[PDB]
Amino acid sequence: DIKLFGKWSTDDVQINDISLQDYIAVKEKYAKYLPHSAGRYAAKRFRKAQCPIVERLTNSMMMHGRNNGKKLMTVRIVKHAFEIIHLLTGENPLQVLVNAIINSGPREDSTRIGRAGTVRRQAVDVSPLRRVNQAIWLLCTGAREAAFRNIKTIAECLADELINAAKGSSNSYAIKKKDELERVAKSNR
């Protein structure tokens, strides 16, 4: 039925976790023709889980100062990344995106106890919505400082840090910094 960018099917994808079951977007009714729908989801608590996750990626992709309002420059980045994913892995670019979200979010964190400047942490659980938010804040971050000055264009570098993050490879920036947050999560336990 509804195709993202008119060319990606939305029903053949399959989530794997149940911890991120409802806090990951589109399966059957969040199928939007475009990422930018311009809804108001920051109005009350627990409403950014019910916006499309491609829109979550584009919203977290305009997160530099010189690009802090440009969204029609951002939908032509997911449109210029999902085709690169569909040519590199040969299947739906939405499924690999969900697999990159699931493997990149930390599942165990530590909070600072003590005064200002010094730390003595203690390990705590991670909420599932914060696991979703921490994933896009890492996956979106990885496609900026990589593609800063290394000539290559930024639109395919988002695919470079999404496809290598779906498999759980250690060359992707997100699961690296996830496991750097996990080694310090093992340090207290």
């Binding site: 705590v124 909420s127 599932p128």
Partner: protein, 61 residues
């Protein structure tokens, strides 16, 4: 031994800067083992977590 878990009821909110929510945690293997685990993030009733360790009780910070 990666264990998966439920959420019954958040108790309060603790930590130094109030960030840590205290939630009463059920297991998804249908046992009545009601562990208390501190969680960092927005959590409501009916959530499902992935506990790496599943033996430490919650304590104040």
């Amino acid at each position: 031994p990666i264990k998966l878990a439920r959420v019954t009821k958040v108790l309060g909110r603790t930590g130094s800067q109030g960030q840590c929510t205290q939630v009463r945690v059920e297991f998804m293997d249908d046992t009545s083992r009601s562990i208390i685990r501190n969680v960092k993030g927005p959590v409501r009733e009916g959530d499902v977590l992935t506990l790496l360790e599943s033996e430490r009780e919650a304590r104040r910070l």
